[PDB]
With several copies, the nearest count.
Chain A
């Protein structure tokens, strides 16, 4: 319970959150840019034309990533629940 431990808690939390969320968001941005380039250059653009592929991409990437995105949480929540009696002491 030293203010180094309390800040290490947060520094681990945000790193796990980034590791989880960054693949999905990066696929979303990649699909967005790939279609937005095709959006111009043959100028045609209504408004979206791209939210549908931005759903296809996430729906694919979640199944492809799958297991280890689970394993991260499984490991870290377990270590948390195991170290709880030593955080106090």
Chain B
């Protein structure tokens, strides 16, 4: 039984981190690292830790509501998780329904051949999750691609200047990297980035 057990080692925690956040923040930082030259920040520890810390920050009120409403009577273990799920899904759902764009909801309600819903809370979870994740991908890319442009402009300017002199055989990616560090720490570029990512998220 090496197969069935071991596949769920990453499956379940990844799904639990797909529900709420940590799906767009990784992507923003990964796009940053795709810019800014080479990796220059090891994913295996640094980006994962950072993007998990920011999520534990942003979702603090959510975990607080869960802790009070469901976690605390779960210390009694009153009921198997039925309202624990529900009274814990409702903060999760209300947090999720706030970020899911409109088109995605309608589309994935069509693809399931569902019936007309009267309330938003009536939207089943198996319909919400993929719409939420799709919306989050299509906003994470909307932020990330808007982050690049200055970096690519510096790249283009440096390359044009180098070729203006006669230096064909230089890898201008190696002269770019320092300027793309000074124009990152010089505009306080990290604080702006994280304040944006933490504000624009909930709003």
Contact = CB atoms under 8 A, between A and B. Distances in A.
Interface residues of B, number: 32
A33 interface: no
Contacts of A24: 161, 164
Interface string B144-188: 001101101110110011011110100000000000001101111
Contacts of A47: 166, 168
Nearest to A13: B149
A66 interface: no
Interface of A: 1, 3, 6, 9, 13, 16-17, 20-21, 24-25, 28-29, 32, 46-48, 51-52, 54-55, 58, 70, 73-74, 76-78, 80-82, 84-89
26 contacts: A1-B142, A6-B186, A13-B149, A13-B152, A13-B153, A21-B156, A28-B164, A47-B168, A48-B163, A48-B166, A52-B160, A54-B165, A58-B165, A70-B186, A73-B183, A77-B187, A78-B192, A80-B146, A80-B147, A80-B149, A81-B187, A81-B189, A84-B146, A87-B142, A88-B139, A88-B142
